[PDB]
């Protein structure tokens, strides 16, 4: 996160850390959607062009974390993965279209003050909230500049109009993505950066006071560059595949 702030304790109890064993290291962000399911970006696990292709044996999920580096002895819970599911149509060849994956934990996590699931949007919620001008929130332990924080960082960014998104890159944008950030004429700045991938873009419904995950940190060219925007996986658009896997497994 660039131009973010330290998160408050218990601010994003769904925030999950993807962590590799050997070498021990921070892979990506992720989100807790239930006691047994985690949502992340597919590119966190598979990206052939960088020879990236992780299996369940390769990683650990760290939940209820605040500190990037510390083993939060009485607070975090660490889980092993049972199985990984990448969208059958994730396009790592071209534009990271459908950048989403599900991870099934070996055992369910008990909730706590620091661990709690985020809601997945419904058609009406997605409809009311996914509006240009509307602000969402991103969190991660990623790079501070296009440099590593000691604690989870947070930033609030407005959804940008689809035309603007399209005109800011040479990359082929799809309906499965949305962009967010401030424009050069608004004087505020901030963005996600490497290390933040797989993290949630959340919005708080004004109807029911609940937090919903609308996006997954996906891609961007550099970080917090003027006239550029961060791209996120459009969660609602991929909801049927999510549901499909959950019911099926």
């Amino acid at each position: 996160i660039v131009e973010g702030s330290d998160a408050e304790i218990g601010m994003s109890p769904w925030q999950v850390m993807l962590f590799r064993k050997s070498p021990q290291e921070l892979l990506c962000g992720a989100s807790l959607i239930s006691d047994r399911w985690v949502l992340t970006a597919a590119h966190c696990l598979l990206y052939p062009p960088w020879d990236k292709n992780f299996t369940e044996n390769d990683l650990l999920v760290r939940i209820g974390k605040h500190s990037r580096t510390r083993y939060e002895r009485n607070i975090e819970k660490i889980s092993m993965l049972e199985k990984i599911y990448i969208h059958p149509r994730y396009n790592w060849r071209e534009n990271l279209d459908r950048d989403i994956a599900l991870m099934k934990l070996k055992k369910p996590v008990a909730f706590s003050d620091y661990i709690h699931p985020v809601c997945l949007p419904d058609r009406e919620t997605a409809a009311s909230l996914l509006q240009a001008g509307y602000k969402g929130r991103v969190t991660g332990w990623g790079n501070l500049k296009e440099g590593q924080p000691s604690v989870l960082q947070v930033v609030n960014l407005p959804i940008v109009e689809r035309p603007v998104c399209k005109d800011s890159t040479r990359i082929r944008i799809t309906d499965n993505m949305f962009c967010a950030g401030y424009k050069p004429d608004e004087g505020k700045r901030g963005d996600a950066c490497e290390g933040d991938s797989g993290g949630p873009f959340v919005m708080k419904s004004p109807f029911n006071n609940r937090w919903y995950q609308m996006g997954i940190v996906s891609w961007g060219e550099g970080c917090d560059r003027d006239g550029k925007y961060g791209f996120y996986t459009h969660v609602f658009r991929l909801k049927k595949w999510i549901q499909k896997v959950i019911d099926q497994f």
């Binding site: 070498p23 290291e25 921070l26 650990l60 990037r68 580096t69 510390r70 083993y71």
Partner: peptide, 7 residues
């Protein structure tokens, strides 16, 4: 890395 060992 910057990381405190995990049990």
């Amino acid at each position: 890395g910057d990381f405190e060992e995990i049990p």
